[PDB]
């Protein structure tokens, strides 16, 4: 599903994303825009012969499990497919165990290059949140 920009706000801020760790939900928002275009179907390979899969474009090297990236860790516990749904219930879960792991939101190289030292407040401007 191709989320709306307020529509994706306010099911980060429902699912605890808001603030989490310090990024407050402007962040995350913007980080899906770059990642994802707001598209839970999105998918990407990389060089290396992994994945990402998502709104936040989680990579199966690490995270997820896509039975195709050989010598790859399952850090999240599921496969890479629960990371596409319309809820993006698992992807969130996932992205609070990466943002988590010292790195915090630099793991996203979309945040990091359009979202960090910017106005992320105006990615929620004029939502009822
Ligand atoms: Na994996």
């Known amino acids: ?3 709306g920009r307020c529509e994706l706000a306010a099911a980060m801020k429902r699912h605890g994303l808001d603030n989490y760790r310090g990024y407050s939900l402007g962040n995350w928002v913007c980080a899906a825009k770059f990642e994802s275009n707001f ?4 998918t990407n390979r990389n060089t290396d012969g992994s994945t990402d899969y998502g ?3 989680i990579n199966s090297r690490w995270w997820c499990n896509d039975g ?3 010598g790859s860790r399952n850090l999240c516990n599921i496969p890479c ?4 749904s319309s809820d993006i219930t698992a992807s969130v879960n996932c992205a609070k165990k990466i943002v988590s792991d010292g790195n915090g939101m630099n793991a996203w190289v979309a ?3 359009r979202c960090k030292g910017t106005d992320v407040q105006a990615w929620i401007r004029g939502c009822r949140l």
Do not use: D, E, H, M
């Open 1 to 3: 599903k191709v989320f």
């Open 39 to 42: 598209n839970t179907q999105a």
């Open 55 to 57: 709104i936040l474009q």
């Open 68 to 70: 195709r990236t050989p």
């Open 81 to 84: 497919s629960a990371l596409l």
């Open 111 to 113: 945040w990091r290059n």
